[PDB]
Amino acid sequence: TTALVCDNGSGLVKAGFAGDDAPRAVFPSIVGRPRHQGVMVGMGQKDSYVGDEAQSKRGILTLKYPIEHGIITNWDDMEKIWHHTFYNELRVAPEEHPTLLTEAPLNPKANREKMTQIMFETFNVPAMYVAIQAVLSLYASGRTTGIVLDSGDGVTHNVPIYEGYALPHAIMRLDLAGRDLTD
Amino acid sequence: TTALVCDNGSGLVKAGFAGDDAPRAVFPSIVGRPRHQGVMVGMGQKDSYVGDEAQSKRGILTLKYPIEHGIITNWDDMEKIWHHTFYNELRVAPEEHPTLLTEAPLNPKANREKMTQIMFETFNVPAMYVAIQAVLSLYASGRTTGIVLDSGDGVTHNVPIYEGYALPHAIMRLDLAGRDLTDYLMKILTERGYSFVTTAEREIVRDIKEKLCYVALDFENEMATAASSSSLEKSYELPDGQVITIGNERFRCPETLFQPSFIGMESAGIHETTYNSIMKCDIDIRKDLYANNVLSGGTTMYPGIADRMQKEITALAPSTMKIKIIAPPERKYSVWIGGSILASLSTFQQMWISKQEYDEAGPSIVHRKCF
Amino acid sequence: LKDAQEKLELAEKKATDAEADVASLNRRIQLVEEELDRAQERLATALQKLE
Amino acid sequence: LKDAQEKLELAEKKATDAEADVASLNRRIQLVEEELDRAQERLATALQKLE
Ligand SMILES: Nc1ncnc2c1ncn2[C@@H]1O[C@H](COP(=O)(O)OP(=O)(O)O)[C@@H](O)[C@H]1O
Numbered sequence: 001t002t003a004l005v006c007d008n009g010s011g012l013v014k015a016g017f018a019g020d021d022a023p024r025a026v027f028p029s030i031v032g033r034p035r036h037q038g039v040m041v042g043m044g045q046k047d048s049y050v051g052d053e054a055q056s057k058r059g060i061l062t063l064k065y066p067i068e069h070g071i072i073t074n075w076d077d078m079e080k081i082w083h084h085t086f087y088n089e090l091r092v093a094p095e096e097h098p099t100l101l102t103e104a105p106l107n108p109k110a111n112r113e114k115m116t117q118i119m120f121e122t123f124n125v126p127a128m129y130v131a132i133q134a135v136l137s138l139y140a141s142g143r144t145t146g147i148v149l150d151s152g153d154g155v156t157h158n159v160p161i162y163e164g165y166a167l168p169h170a171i172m173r174l175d176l177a178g179r180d181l182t183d
Numbered sequence: 184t185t186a187l188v189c190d191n192g193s194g195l196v197k198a199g200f201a202g203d204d205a206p207r208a209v210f211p212s213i214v215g216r217p218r219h220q221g222v223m224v225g226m227g228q229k230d231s232y233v234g235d236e237a238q239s240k241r242g243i244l245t246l247k248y249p250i251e252h253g254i255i256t257n258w259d260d261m262e263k264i265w266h267h268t269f270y271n272e273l274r275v276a277p278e279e280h281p282t283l284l285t286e287a288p289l290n291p292k293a294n295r296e297k298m299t300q301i302m303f304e305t306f307n308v309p310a311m312y313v314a315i316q317a318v319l320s321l322y323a324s325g326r327t328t329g330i331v332l333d334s335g336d337g338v339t340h341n342v343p344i345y346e347g348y349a350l351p352h353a354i355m356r357l358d359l360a361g362r363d364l365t366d367y368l369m370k371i372l373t374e375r376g377y378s379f380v381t382t383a384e385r386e387i388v389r390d391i392k393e394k395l396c397y398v399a400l401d402f403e404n405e406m407a408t409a410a411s412s413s414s415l416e417k418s419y420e421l422p423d424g425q426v427i428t429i430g431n432e433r434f435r436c437p438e439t440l441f442q443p444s445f446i447g448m449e450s451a452g453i454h455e456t457t458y459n460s461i462m463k464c465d466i467d468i469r470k471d472l473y474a475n476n477v478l479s480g481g482t483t484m485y486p487g488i489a490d491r492m493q494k495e496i497t498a499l500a501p502s503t504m505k506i507k508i509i510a511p512p513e514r515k516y517s518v519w520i521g522g523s524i525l526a527s528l529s530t531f532q533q534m535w536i537s538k539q540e541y542d543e544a545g546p547s548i549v550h551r552k553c554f
Numbered sequence: 555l556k557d558a559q560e561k562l563e564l565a566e567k568k569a570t571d572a573e574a575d576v577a578s579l580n581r582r583i584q585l586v587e588e589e590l591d592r593a594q595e596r597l598a599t600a601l602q603k604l605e
Numbered sequence: 606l607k608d609a610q611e612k613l614e615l616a617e618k619k620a621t622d623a624e625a626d627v628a629s630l631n632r633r634i635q636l637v638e639e640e641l642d643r644a645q646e647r648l649a650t651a652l653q654k655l656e
Pocket residue numbers: 008009010011012013151152153154178179182
């Protein structure tokens with residue numbers, strides 16, 4: 001079967017089946033509970049709008065990103081985001097598809113372990129693999145050497161690679177990124 | 184069984200069974216004791232004529248409304264009005280029917296608690312629920328967003344709603360309404376010689392206001408035109424003859440809505456309190472509120488108001504937004520139609536304040552979860 | 555009276571007919587205005603795309 | 606009745622005025638239908654130019 005190449009990121013979740021050119025569904029990763037009271041009855045008001053739906057009703061929501069700086073600070077919201085990504089934006093049950101998450105360098109271990117535990121227990125995938133976000137960006141350029149500066153929205157990290165041999169002592173991770181520029 | 188959708192209002196009580204198009208019985212809410220002595224014996228003279236009966240014997244009565252500005256100031260008279268409404272205009276005993284009253288926003292708590300206590304103790308209804316008069320008017324339009332300006336006869340209030348989530352911090356309640364316009368018209372008619380003083384003649388001035396007055400599109404041009412030509416002077420026949428001619432009093436009476444400085448009120452008109460109510464809302468739902476401005480209530484029936492208000496708001500608002508004013512022809516009964524729709528819903532059937540709940544928590548149950 | 559009776563009945567029927575006509579036409583004008591506005595929003599989308 | 610006679614006459618006149626507005630609303634409906642069709646066409650051409 002085909003593999004699911006998910007990419008959590010921080011600010012935009014990008015996902016799609018392996019072997020294509022562009023991600024199938026790209027949508028902000030925000031989960032916003034309503035904050036006002038609500039008087040219309042039977043309007044079908046949900047308790048949390050996630051993804052791109054909460055960028056249209058954002059006038060009466062309190063959007064809050066579940067990923068602060070690479071690390072994940074709110075596991076329930078992240079689980080909700082993943083569930084939405086699998087079931088509504090791709091409509092493929094995870095029981096029949098391998099997954100390939102991505103993770104920033106130098107992140108806490110507990111984050112990665114919890115990520116794999118969720119993927120194996122809740123969604124019950126067949127097999128998942130976690131890859132460093134810079135090696136992939138080096139794949140896409142068709143190179144095999146080079147030093148890649150991957151300035152995302154959460155964290156900016158700079159992984160040098162030569163001839164396929166990564167240099168673990170030369171990774172410089174800096175926490176300034178797009179969110180701090182927005183602020 | 185069926186629910187009773189009563190709507191106390193202030194000036195006209197509108198009631199009827201849930202699920203219809205129009206209220207079954209609409210009659211003024213006035214209770215007038217006789218004031219003269221009375222010499223015929225055995226004529227069967229009662230001590231208080233209520234409802235539409237006192238609009239026919241008003242020549243020898245002293246009519247007095249039991250609801251001043253939304254709030255209820257005379258509880259015995261209001262109880263009498265309710266008793267009349269249930270037993271003579273609908274002829275259905277309240278022991279077998281839920282009731283759905285309506286209440287203006289930002290009203291005193293004691294009024295609402297006393298209302299529920301009366302409905303549960305005196306009339307002994309099975310279950311009653313109190314709803315804000317603007318949400319119903321939004322129901323009737325079939326929308327789910329929009330900012331509704333419900334200019335009744337007692338009080339004008341402006342409740343903005345988005346996606347079903349009401350914004351409690353943006354409700355702008357103003358106490359200028361139809362009654363103050365009647366008093367101001369009665370006060371400016373004296374400039375031609377016609378003096379109306381008695382509380383019975385207030386009804387005649389109200390009829391003049393309803394049948395003749397209109398809202399000018401541009402005030403200064405109309406004031407200049409009425410002062411040169413005579414194409415505006417419309418005449419009207421009093422209940423006894425002696426026709427009267429109304430000149431530029433026609434568009435000066437309802438102009439008070441847009442310039443409350445005429446009756447000495449400080450606040451801004453209904454054209455600017457809507458814009459202020461919008462600007463208090465969040466920055467991302469202002470376009471939808473601009474496009475779905477809803478009018479309701481009786482006093483918004485003046486010929487030519489849906490254009491004056493749109494012109495004013497377009498002047499105030501940013502030039503890019505589209506300003507649209509929804510003015511359905513069934514404006515007067517909009518609140519009651521919305522009340523019927525709400526009472527007819529299946530999802531709403533478990534929100535009533537059941538009597539056993541009131542017995543356990545007292546009248547203060549209304550402020551609790553069952554709002 | 556009979557003359558008044560017929561006058562009253564005919565005027566009432568005419569009034570109800572006019573009311574129904576104007577109400578349904580109001581619904582129609584609402585619908586067509588919705589058509590116009592929603593089409594305008596499509597126009598804005600297209601303008602942004604082309605630019 | 607004389608007053609009922611005047612009332613029925615006034616109500617039938619009101620019916621006729623509602624019919625005049627029925628005509629005006631018909632004109633609005635027709636012109637807005639032209640607008641709807643023109644918008645369909647213009648949106649089609651805009652999307653084509655986008656392609
Ligand atoms: N065209 C653009 N110009 C400038 N900044 C952009 C542009 N597109 C995205 N950004 C910034 O980049 C962020 C998205 O980064 P992204 O690569 O999606 O992060 P992640 O690595 O979490 O996927 C946004 O928050 C935005 O601030």
